From Swiss-Prot, chains A, B:
Post-translational modification: Ubiquitinated by FBXL22, leading to proteasomal degradation.
Function comment: F-actin cross-linking protein which is thought to anchor actin to a variety of intracellular structures. This is a bundling protein.
Tissue and organ distribution: Expressed in both skeletal and cardiac muscle.
Annotated family: Belongs to the alpha-actinin family.
UniProt lineage: Eukaryota, Metazoa, Chordata, Craniata, Vertebrata
Disease listed for this protein: Cardiomyopathy, familial hypertrophic, 23, with or without left ventricular non-compaction: A hereditary heart disorder characterized by ventricular hypertrophy, which is usually asymmetric and often involves the interventricular septum. The symptoms include dyspnea, syncope, collapse, palpitations, and chest pain. They can be readily provoked by exercise. The disorder has inter- and intrafamilial variability ranging from benign to malignant forms with high risk of cardiac failure and sudden cardiac death. Cardiomyopathy, dilated, 1AA, with or without left ventricular non-compaction: A disorder characterized by ventricular dilation and impaired systolic function, resulting in congestive heart failure and arrhythmia. Patients are at risk of premature death.
Each Spectrin repeat, start to end: 14-119, 129-240
Name of the protein in its database record: Alpha-actinin-2
Lineage: superkingdom: Eukaryota
Full-length numbering of the shown residues: 391 to 635 of 894
Summary of subunit composition and partner proteins: Homodimer; antiparallel. Also forms heterodimers with ACTN3. Interacts with ADAM12, MYOZ1, MYOZ2 and MYOZ3. Interacts via its C-terminal region with the LDB3 PDZ domain. Interacts with XIRP2. Interacts with DST isoform 1 (via N-terminus). Interacts with PARVB. Interacts with SYNPO2.
Encoding gene (name): ACTN2
Amino acid sequence: GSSNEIRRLERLEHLAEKFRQKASTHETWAYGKEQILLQKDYESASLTEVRALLRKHEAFESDLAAHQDRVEQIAAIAQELNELDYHDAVNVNDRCQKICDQWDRLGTLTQKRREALERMEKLLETIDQLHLEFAKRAAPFNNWMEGAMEDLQDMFIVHSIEEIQSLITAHEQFKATLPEADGERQSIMAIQNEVEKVIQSYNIRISSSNPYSTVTMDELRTKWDKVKQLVPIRDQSLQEELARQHAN
Amino acid sequence: GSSNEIRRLERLEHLAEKFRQKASTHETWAYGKEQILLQKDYESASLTEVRALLRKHEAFESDLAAHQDRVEQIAAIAQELNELDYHDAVNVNDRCQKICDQWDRLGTLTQKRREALERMEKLLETIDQLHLEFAKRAAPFNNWMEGAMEDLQDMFIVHSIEEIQSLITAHEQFKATLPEADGERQSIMAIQNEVEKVIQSYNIRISSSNPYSTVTMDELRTKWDKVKQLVPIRDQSLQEELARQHAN
């Protein structure tokens, strides 16, 4: 009936004024965030980088969880103004609704960016763990093959029927390895597939060369061929030596 | 007295021939390795990269430990040929000596490259562990300062002498934080020094910006100033409100 009802109607005005402040605020804080969340900056990234992202994404997710409160306040005020029949309620309700709707999407997008990151980290991690292996087992292998190429081509010096008869032996014990060793040589090859394959699964533009190993798998086969090709040339020479110790 | 002594003298010839083979081999394997070991490819590297190096340096150190044997064989033969007075012994001895001398240096260099790497890894690691921290504690901070800038600027709506008398309170309980909170704000600043300092210790051409945090320390101070500058503007407004609740 005036005054006492006027003050009561001005409160409502004050409330909305309180509503526009907070709304205005939140609206400016959520500007562009969507675009920032729908961005694709991790498809080429490294295990390192991606790990940087999850870390910065936790920052963003902490800023987020903080504003959940501002959003409920905004909603509460628009709710009161609707119930007290503020005269411009459809408008404030609409601004509040457009805000709350956006909130739900930020939620989705955000959870989405985390999932794309947590999986890019696993691919990247996985790839790494393969590479490491390849190199771990590929080093000893490179060794053995060098320790065999030089051995199978080592000039011998025998002047008895018995010296040349221990070599033919030691060298016979080494062949029994050729197979088993070729078992390992199969594996290394395998590990090399599991990598180029996983890489090939997602983005095929990433590099395959192993940053942990210089011996590549190509050159690792080349060596094995020579190892295989020497085995026979040795046999001959060792035969021919026997054919001189029992020949004198 | 011929023949039986001839065969004995031909053995020596055969032995040296055996010596030139192995020498020739080792010599070609150690070509350029020195240069490869005196190279400086880690001063700009990342924690990641360097870690790649130690891994490839273990490969090189495994190839090394393997040839120690070839070196002792070479030495043994030159030793025999000296004792049996081979006629070209000074020469083989000299080739063996030049090889053994090189071996000792590869040893030094190699141990040296490992040490430069193990320490570059620690600097790099260290830097990283600092950066992480800065960002870890710098995120919550950024929050609080936003959660305070918006609070100290939040329009109030009171119509009694008691409502405006709880705010003045809640807001009085918040100030007791300003100091302690400034304690944290000091720390974050510190962690930020420990990094730029360590970085500045070795190579000063590396970047300082934190890959784990977007909030820089500069902009982190800017916010604290506003937080400090609002505290007073609030006081006023809250005073003036009391000067209207006890004024009506």
